[PDB]
Design a protein around this ligand. Structure first.
Ligand SMILES: [Zn+2]
Lengths: 327, 207
């Protein structure tokens, strides 16, 4: 009779909006030739076949039209980025991509619970509260280090063997993505030739080099240096048509920037990878103890907490609770 | 470079020149006695599957080369054209295995391969129980092009690339050259199939 009916406004979308409103995305010069895609909030399906030709155009679409939880752009260069049929689009080159296969590399801990009763469910729905269960995957800094290794080795093979000039970027969540902005006859490498490079970098056909000095020049030295192949997801590399999550965008699963690492050594996995400032009141769904952004956090179901926005947004997008308010 | 060994080096028309003006291959063929038969033999030695005789063993190598191509063209046997080009390239290999460095490097350029010399790289191999060294290097992009339809042995993974370049040894370089030659042939047959030939010449090469 006196029950107040008021819906909690999504602050997360606010944060993102504010971010994208002033963020300066790392965009290719051949912007007009690339198809942009985006996964919106509350929608599992992508909003593809977009095509802009100015940072501003892109900015406005995001802040005004559709807000991206995840935002990318095709690696491939087209003549009609907006076309719907591959024949009409007209592919004419694609960038060279590599991505540390974090799924294979780390093996992280996941949990399935019911946001309501905060209990562990095995099924996707909670019979008791008739609600869909959630899943939490604890991403550790031990794992980020593993990826940073492979990225190191990758940049080596890339610069040392192929004499290329790679650019490293934090995946924004679980790992890294290395990319070569090759426009030469390179950009035209067929998927099969690409698959060649992929297997090379993965140390597939590569033999061991029992004698070999650590100073050999190629797999010869490398093998004798302990390195036996980089752990990448070939599919990313062999795929001529692929979506490059735009550098400087926020990763929908962490709220962390897709930052570019210039010195693999300096890279630290902090809450510093989040552009957000203030503080946020967080309401945990469950009582849990886990590492978050390289620090253990104890959470009790129900007990509000006043944490930094960074962790706040993070924990929220990771399904551990909700960001009830901001300060 | 010995045109006597690598006929394909010389253009048919440059050869036809020394016989007069407006001289057409068929014209010579129609009047030559040995040529057509020398070709027929070659096409046989393969049809059977026997080593093909080097071109230096001939009196008019270049003319014999283009004649066996023109015959293959007329015969209309894809299976044979392919069968021939393999046996042919094999033969040329043998010759190269005795060629100079500068010479090997020249046929490549002619054959359109971007292989050059570079400050060779040496490294201890365990199969030779001794240090091995490569001096020929192609750029990885090209190398991928050239080896697109070859075997696993050529797979970039088993290769040795450094600073963008794939390092090769003489034996490798040769195998690569041998490969383009094999293709060069299939391609050289087209321009001959171009114009119309005399019924008399046809029947001659068909018997
Ligand atoms: Zn429940």
């Amino acid at each position: 009779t006196f029950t107040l009916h008021q819906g909690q406004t999504n602050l997360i979308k606010s944060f993102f909006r504010n971010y994208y409103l002033n963020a300066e995305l790392e965009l290719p010069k051949d912007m007009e030739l690339r198809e942009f895609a985006l996964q919106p909030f509350g929608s599992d399906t992508y909003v593809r076949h977009l095509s802009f030709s100015s940072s501003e155009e892109l900015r406005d679409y995001l802040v005004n039209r559709n807000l991206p939880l995840h935002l990318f752009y095709s690696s491939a260069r087209y003549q009609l980025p907006s076309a719907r049929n591959m024949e009409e689009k007209a592919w004419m080159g694609s960038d060279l991509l590599f991505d540390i296969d974090a799924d294979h590399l780390c093996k992280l801990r996941s949990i399935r619970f019911c946001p309501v009763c905060g209990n562990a469910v095995v099924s996707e729905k909670c019979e008791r509260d008739n609600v869909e269960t959630l899943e939490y995957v604890e991403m550790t800094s031990e794992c980020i280090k593993r990826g940073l290794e492979q990225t190191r080795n990758l940049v080596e093979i890339l610069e040392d063997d192929f004499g290329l000039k790679p650019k490293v970027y934090f995946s924004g969540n679980r790992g890294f993505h290395v990319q070569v902005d090759c426009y030469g006859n390179c950009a035209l490498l067929d998927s099969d030739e690409r698959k060649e490079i992929a297997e090379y970098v993965m140390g597939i056909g590569v033999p061991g080099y029992p004698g070999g000095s650590e100073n050999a020049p190629g797999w010869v030295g490398r093998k004798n240096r302990g390195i036996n192949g980089v752990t990448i997801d070939e599919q990313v590399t062999i795929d001529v048509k692929r979506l490059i999550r735009i550098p400087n965008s926020l990763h929908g699963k962490s709220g962390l920037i897709v930052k570019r690492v210039p010195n693999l050594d300096d890279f630290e996995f902090n809450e510093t990878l989040s552009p957000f400032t203030g503080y946020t009141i967080f309401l945990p769904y469950i009582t849990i103890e886990t590492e978050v952004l390289g620090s253990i956090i104890k959470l009790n179901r129900g007990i509000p907490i006043k944490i930094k926005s960074s962790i706040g947004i993070y924990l929220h997008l990771r399904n551990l609770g909700e960001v009830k308010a901001y300060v | 470079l010995d045109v006597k060994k690598y006929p394909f080096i010389k253009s048919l028309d440059d050869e036809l020149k020394k016989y007069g003006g407006g001289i057409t291959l068929t014209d010579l063929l129609l009047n030559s006695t040995t040529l057509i038969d020398q070709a027929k033999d070659r096409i046989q030695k393969t049809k059977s599957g026997d080593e093909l005789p080097h071109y230096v063993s001939y009196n008019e190598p270049v003319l014999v080369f283009y004649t066996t191509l023109l015959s293959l063209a007329i015969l209309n046997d894809v299976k044979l054209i392919r069968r021939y080009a393999y046996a042919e390239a094999k033969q040329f290999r043998s010759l190269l295995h005795t060629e100079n460095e500068e010479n090997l490097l020249e046929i490549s350029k002619l054959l359109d391969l971007k292989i050059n010399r570079c400050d060779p790289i040496k490294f201890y191999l365990e199969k030779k129980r001794r240090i091995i060294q490569k001096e020929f290097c192609v750029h990885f992009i090209d190398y991928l092009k050239y080896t697109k339809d070859l075997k696993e042995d050529w797979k970039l993974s088993g290769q040795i690339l450094h600073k963008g370049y794939v390092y090769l040894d003489k034996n490798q370089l040769i195998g690569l050259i041998a490969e383009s030659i094999k293709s060069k042939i299939v391609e050289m047959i087209r321009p001959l199939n171009l114009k119309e030939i005399p019924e008399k010449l046809k029947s001659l090469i068909e018997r």
